[PDB]
């Protein structure tokens with residue numbers, strides 16, 4: 001396919017996932033970019049994947065697409081089936097992965113602004129609960145903060161499915177080989193070099209210093225099975241967020257929680273939305 | 278075609294050639310490699326590009342292929358015609374640039390130099406060897422010369438360094454980086470492949486690192502007479518440099534055209550110098 005995919009495959013084999021991700025971030029510097037939300041080259045209209053009952057003033061769920069180069073439109077499909085007849089579920093695209101190939105955001109705030117504008121158009125008067133998994137969970141919180149700070153519109157809630165935020169990333173660093181193998185095992189087509197570069201750019205965004213914390217309440221959803229090997233004496237390997245409103249534990253590991261066990265995630269979400277409403 | 282070439286083009290367009298070279302070097306670490314000279318995936322047999330007169334003990338020229346991703350077997354064709362009827366000229370490939378699946382990259386520079394060394398000794402027989410290289414290839418010519426002396430008990434009779442910019446003197450390289458990157462696209466016969474760009478990055482990194490040994494062979498330093506781009510006089514001298522060369526020759530042209538349009542002048546300097554060192 002592309003040279004970057006070949007290099008990534010070898011990096012994962014040599015257990016140097018983290019090193020290759022840094023290479024992807026540096027290389028992404030030399031891809032054409034958009035520097036203002038207006039200049040975004042793609043249409044970020046959310047897609048409706050599930051319909052709630054008709055019909056009021058009930059929150060709609062917005063799935064925040066994660067950074068995985070093998071991801072995209074498929075990401076929330078299995079999960080969304082469990083929301084049909086319960087809640088509207090909209091998936092918003094992550095800028096820079098589209099289509100000529102899409103312009104990359106110059107910085108994270110620029111991509112978040114683009115997403116915020118598309119979400120606010122789609123949602124209308126309805127309250128919004130943001131949902132993301134893994135790197136998308138980190139992005140869901142960053143979006144939530146930006147909606148609040150810069151768009152006068154804090155979401156009604158955030159659902160963070162297995163987040164590993166800065167300061168709490170040791171297990172995900174220890175398991176980077178499995179993460180890399182999961183990306184390859186989860187391919188439907190070969191990961192494009194353009195999307196690999198997008199993934200590196202966002203990974204770098206998310207390691208950088210961020211402006212603060214959203215006031216929206218948080219549901220922390222955690223996998224119950226470790227993705228790889230872990231010594232008990234090393235501490236808790238589990239996903240982490242500071243002082244969540246509610247915590248839910250679901251079957252599966254970092255990956256299988258969202259497919260195999262997607263109904264369990266959905267059930268935790270539906271219960272929580274009832275509680276906060 | 279290939280993402281790396283598109284990225285490279287943008288980097289040059291944006292005056293970030295140096296930064297992009299670093300990225301190529303880091304990326305190249307994830308290419309399949311050869312760790313021993315024997316494990317080299319390519320036939321490094323030198324090509325005879327010019328023949329000396331039929332009339333023992335006379336030095337043969339060996340063209341050390343440079344690092345440019347747009348190079349290869351065509352590199353010494355113009356220069357070599359001027360050696361016809363004067364000296365044998367053999368051109369040795371640089372490991373990591375071939376095809377046939379693409380070529381393995383050297384794990385380290387010494388590994389690539391040993392592969393070349395064995396090919397050269399086999400091809401040259403008993404004849405004394407004079408190594409020749411231009412730019413990146415001039416740096417490689419010296420490193421090979423030192424490796425031949427140290428690891429093969431076979432110091433060359435001489436080294437011809439055409440426009441070298443060694444680690445102590447790379448301000449002109451930095452100041453003209455845009456022109457150097459554009460020169461690389463200008464000199465494309467076909468689109469530089471991603472595999473070759475990664476090779477070029479891997480070698481640039483090799484040539485930045487600690488290389489302690491100095492060849493005992495005498496050096497002819499051949500210098501371009503024209504600046505490749507604008508240069509502020511107070512920066513110092515823009516010309517190519519080598520520490521304590523045996524002889525220095527200035528030729529017409531710039532860094533590129535000295536070989537492109539003025540190769541006969543380069544051959545003439547080499548031939549005069551070879552006569553002087555031989556007797």
Ligand SMILES: *P(=O)(O)CC(=O)[C@H](C)[C@@H](O)[C@@H](C)C[C@@H](C)CO
Pocket residue numbers: 298343344345346411412413414441442447450457477480481484
């Ligand atoms: P020359 O090969 O035209 C340019 C150089 O002398 C520079 C300093 C050298 O480091 C080479 C190895 C960089 C390559 C990218 C140019 O082929």
Ligand SMILES: [Mg+2]
Pocket residue numbers: 519520521
């Ligand atoms: Mg000196």
